């Protein structure tokens, strides 16, 4: 109903968004292949009133006119794509990426999502699947009579059968890379789908023109840093409290006026 109230009602909402981002980052501190978020803000409208640079006289200009501004709005929350620390949890079905590529996974509806999570399982039919049961691509089947699974640095999946001194190649794991990794649309379950801001999916082999390397027995942890999130909570809490104090001051000002 008054200008300062709207401005401080935008400040509250922006700080609440910042707290939401911080809390979501802290909640997923242990999920493998996670990329933490960062919210960015920008200034709202700026009411012109007296125009800055307006010609007051015929020879004197008015410097920096009465530019009363509106509150703040957040542009977006961008994913900080950095390499999480690798952990040696020593299982043949866990693979970790060393560069900037993504695994391709086929969704049940026929479309393809992209995930950096390397915790793979084997279904009842012998196909490699994501822990959520989504089958990986371009399909790597694993026989029932398998003794050991070896996934090399180039993505070649080999299976050694019983009593045979030579391994059997059962597929080739490829990595998808994008022009813009941030523009991908996250659909949950550690899955990202392609968006027009992420360019087009460029499939590549692990070690060539820019796909990362795969390490077997390793899991890529999250890049969330706990101490920085704690400090950011302390600063967001203070900013939210101060903006609420601005709301309260506006409320008190409106009280006296009405009482008059």
């Amino acid at each position: 109903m008054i200008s300062s109230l709207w401005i401080a009602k935008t400040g509250l909402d922006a700080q609440q968004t910042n707290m939401d981002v911080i809390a979501n980052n802290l909640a997923n501190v242990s999920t493998n292949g996670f990329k933490r978020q960062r919210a960015v803000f920008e200034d709202l409208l700026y009411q012109t009133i007296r125009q800055p640079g307006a010609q007051s006289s015929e020879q004197t200009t008015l410097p920096s006119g009465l530019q009363i501004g509106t509150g703040v709005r957040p542009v977006a929350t961008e994913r900080l794509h950095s390499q999480g620390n690798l952990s040696q949890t020593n299982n043949s079905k866990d693979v970790a990426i060393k560069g900037q590529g993504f695994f391709q996974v086929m969704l049940p509806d026929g479309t393809s999502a992209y995930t950096r999570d390397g915790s793979f399982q084997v279904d009842q039919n012998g196909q490699l699947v994501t822990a959520g049961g989504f089958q990986v691509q371009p399909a790597i089947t694993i026989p029932a009579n398998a003794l050991s699974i070896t996934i090399g640095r180039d993505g070649v999946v080999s299976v050694t059968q019983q009593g045979q001194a030579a391994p059997v190649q059962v597929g080739q794991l490829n990595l998808t890379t994008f022009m813009n990794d941030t523009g991908l649309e996250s659909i949950g379950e550690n899955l990202y789908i392609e968006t027009q801001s992420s360019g087009a999916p460029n499939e590549s082999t692990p070690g060539l023109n820019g796909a990362g390397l795969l390490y077997q027995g390793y899991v890529e942890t999250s890049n969330v840093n706990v101490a920085e999130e704690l400090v950011n909570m302390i600063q967001v809490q203070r900013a939210y409290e101060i903006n609420s104090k601005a709301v309260s001051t506006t409320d008190q000002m409106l009280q006296k006026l009405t009482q008059l």
Binding site: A27, N28, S30, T31, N90, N91, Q121, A131, G132, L147, G188, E189
Partner: protein, 50 residues
């Protein structure tokens, strides 16, 4: 966050001598097959038999 699942590290553990003839250890893959009083089929790696 959502817990996708809970797995079990099916790697071969320690083999410890016991001195009894009725304990069997399964190296590599394999599961002992059991039937309960109801008739359901179960599988177990514990070889402590009696």
């Amino acid at each position: 966050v959502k817990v996708a699942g809970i797995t079990q590290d099916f790697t071969d553990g320690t083999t410890t001598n016991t001195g009894r003839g009725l304990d069997v250890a399964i190296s590599q893959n394999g599961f002992f097959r059991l039937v309960d009083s109801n008739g359901s089929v179960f599988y177990s790696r514990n070889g402590q038999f009696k």
